[PDB]
Amino acid sequence: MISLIAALAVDRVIGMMPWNLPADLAWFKRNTLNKPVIMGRHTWESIGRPLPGRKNIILSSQPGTDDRVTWVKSVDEAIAACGDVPEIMVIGGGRVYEQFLPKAQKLYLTHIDAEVEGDTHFPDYEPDDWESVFSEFHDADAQNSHSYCFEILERRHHH
Ligand SMILES: Nc1nc2c(c(=O)[nH]1)N[C@@H](CNc1ccc(C(=O)N[C@@H](CCC(=O)O)C(=O)O)cc1)CN2
Ligand SMILES: [Cl-]
Ligand SMILES: [Cl-]
Ligand SMILES: [Cl-]
Ligand SMILES: [Mg+2]
Ligand SMILES: [Mg+2]
Ligand SMILES: [Mg+2]
Ligand SMILES: [Mg+2]
């Protein structure tokens, strides 16, 4: 099964960080550890080093040479490279989320209370097609710059 995981500012702006949220990074790690992660080449270059404890699959029509990750050229190849696993995590960026959304059955979202200047957005999804099965709000604190709300949604309908 395919899931997307993303952190969204107001207006669904995503980035590679205008905010400083170690709690969100802990949420990201907890929910991706021991699962393959699929990302586009822009996201890969922004991370710079393979995420530990996860198979790192990079979707790009023009692969790099880095032997530390697995390079694939299509959504279908990305999925095949993951093989028989319970859950595949798609970690962005904008275009990769857009291509994978139709195949996804679960969303892990962090809704951040920040207005920011970026131009890359998380895909449009029809809220009526999803059910909110978890939500938790957290205030900002000495370690986290903004307030945020974790949410998990499960797909109920497809169009
Ligand atoms: N919800 C959430 N989802 C996301 C991101 C986020 O920002 N938060 N960011 C996007 C991908 N970018 C990164 C950049 C850095 C890291 C990263 O470095 N993670 C460490 C944890 C951080 C650390 O302890 O050093 C890890 O092992 O997972 C993860 C995703 C995609 N999805
Ligand atoms: Cl957590
Ligand atoms: Cl990308
Ligand atoms: Cl505090
Ligand atoms: Mg090689
Ligand atoms: Mg889009
Ligand atoms: Mg769309
Ligand atoms: Mg319904």
Side-chain angles (χ1 to χ4, degrees):
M1 179 189 73
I2 289 164
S3 301
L4 316 186
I5 183 159
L8 280 60
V10 172
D11 302 347
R12 269 164 46 244
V13 179
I14 62 182
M16 292 292 94
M17 205 111 287
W19 51 83
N20 170 238
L21 300 175
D24 175 56
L25 292 182
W27 160 270
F28 176 89
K29 189 170 183 180
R30 180 171 69 81
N31 282 302
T32 57
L33 198 61
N34 311 127
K35 308 182 186 169
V37 293
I38 297 172
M39 70 198 86
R41 191 166 178 205
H42 190 266
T43 294
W44 163 240
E45 298 297 341
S46 296
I47 296 169
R49 194 162 188 257
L51 294 170
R54 286 148 284 185
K55 180 172 194 172
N56 289 234
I57 294 165
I58 323 305
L59 177 58
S60 177
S61 61
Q62 55 217 327
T65 48
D66 198 320
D67 285 343
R68 303 175 298 164
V69 299
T70 295
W71 297 93
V72 303
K73 295 189 183 180
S74 73
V75 165
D76 280 1
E77 185 184 5
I79 294 168
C82 294
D84 192 335
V85 295
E87 189 176 18
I88 295 169
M89 302 297 293
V90 177
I91 73 170
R95 196 251 291 160
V96 165
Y97 286 136
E98 184 78 31
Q99 289 176 304
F100 273 93
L101 179 63
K103 289 182 161 62
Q105 293 280 322
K106 191 164 183 183
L107 305 175
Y108 299 78
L109 303 179
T110 304
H111 303 281
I112 303 163
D113 296 320
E115 293 196 19
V116 304
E117 66 143 34
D119 287 314
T120 309
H121 298 268
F122 188 77
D124 289 345
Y125 61 94
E126 299 293 318
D128 192 44
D129 292 347
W130 300 81
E131 179 180 3
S132 186
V133 300
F134 174 80
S135 61
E136 288 300 325
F137 173 85
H138 296 273
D139 286 285
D141 57 34
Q143 285 72 52
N144 295 272
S145 62
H146 295 75
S147 58
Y148 49 99
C149 188
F150 297 131
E151 187 176 27
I152 300 173
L153 299 108
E154 288 178 0
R155 187 186 288 279
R156 298 290 170 253
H157 306 288
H158 205 290
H159 305 300

mmCIF file of all heavy atoms in Angstrom, residues 64-67 69 71, ligand 5:
data_model
loop_
_atom_site.group_PDB
_atom_site.id
_atom_site.type_symbol
_atom_site.label_atom_id
_atom_site.label_comp_id
_atom_site.label_asym_id
_atom_site.label_seq_id
_atom_site.Cartn_x
_atom_site.Cartn_y
_atom_site.Cartn_z
ATOM 1 N N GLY A 64 21.063 10.294 -11.143
ATOM 2 C CA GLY A 64 22.429 10.610 -10.770
ATOM 3 C C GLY A 64 23.239 9.330 -10.738
ATOM 4 O O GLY A 64 22.801 8.307 -11.279
ATOM 5 N N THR A 65 24.434 9.380 -10.157
ATOM 6 C CA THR A 65 25.320 8.211 -10.157
ATOM 7 C C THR A 65 25.452 7.587 -8.764
ATOM 8 O O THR A 65 25.901 6.448 -8.633
ATOM 9 C CB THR A 65 26.725 8.554 -10.721
ATOM 10 O OG1 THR A 65 27.224 9.750 -10.114
ATOM 11 C CG2 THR A 65 26.662 8.763 -12.226
ATOM 12 N N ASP A 66 25.023 8.330 -7.746
ATOM 13 C CA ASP A 66 25.210 7.952 -6.346
ATOM 14 C C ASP A 66 24.756 6.515 -6.112
ATOM 15 O O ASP A 66 23.576 6.187 -6.306
ATOM 16 C CB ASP A 66 24.424 8.932 -5.465
ATOM 17 C CG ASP A 66 24.865 8.924 -4.019
ATOM 18 O OD1 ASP A 66 25.141 7.844 -3.481
ATOM 19 O OD2 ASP A 66 24.916 10.017 -3.407
ATOM 20 N N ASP A 67 25.681 5.656 -5.696
ATOM 21 C CA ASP A 67 25.377 4.237 -5.533
ATOM 22 C C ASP A 67 24.707 3.910 -4.204
ATOM 23 O O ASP A 67 24.334 2.755 -3.955
ATOM 24 C CB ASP A 67 26.639 3.378 -5.712
ATOM 25 C CG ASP A 67 27.061 3.242 -7.173
ATOM 26 O OD1 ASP A 67 26.246 3.527 -8.072
ATOM 27 O OD2 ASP A 67 28.216 2.851 -7.420
ATOM 28 N N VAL A 69 21.820 4.957 -3.156
ATOM 29 C CA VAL A 69 20.375 4.958 -3.306
ATOM 30 C C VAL A 69 20.004 4.170 -4.558
ATOM 31 O O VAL A 69 20.872 3.798 -5.354
ATOM 32 C CB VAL A 69 19.825 6.395 -3.398
ATOM 33 C CG1 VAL A 69 20.156 7.175 -2.106
ATOM 34 C CG2 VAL A 69 20.379 7.127 -4.614
ATOM 35 N N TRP A 71 17.917 4.134 -8.055
ATOM 36 C CA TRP A 71 17.392 5.071 -9.034
ATOM 37 C C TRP A 71 16.384 4.401 -9.942
ATOM 38 O O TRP A 71 16.651 3.329 -10.472
ATOM 39 C CB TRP A 71 18.524 5.614 -9.892
ATOM 40 C CG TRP A 71 19.537 6.395 -9.128
ATOM 41 C CD1 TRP A 71 20.699 5.919 -8.579
ATOM 42 C CD2 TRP A 71 19.506 7.804 -8.839
ATOM 43 N NE1 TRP A 71 21.386 6.938 -7.970
ATOM 44 C CE2 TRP A 71 20.680 8.103 -8.114
ATOM 45 C CE3 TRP A 71 18.607 8.836 -9.126
ATOM 46 C CZ2 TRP A 71 20.974 9.383 -7.661
ATOM 47 C CZ3 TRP A 71 18.908 10.120 -8.680
ATOM 48 C CH2 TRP A 71 20.081 10.375 -7.951
HETATM 49 MG MG MG B 5 25.782 2.667 -9.938
#
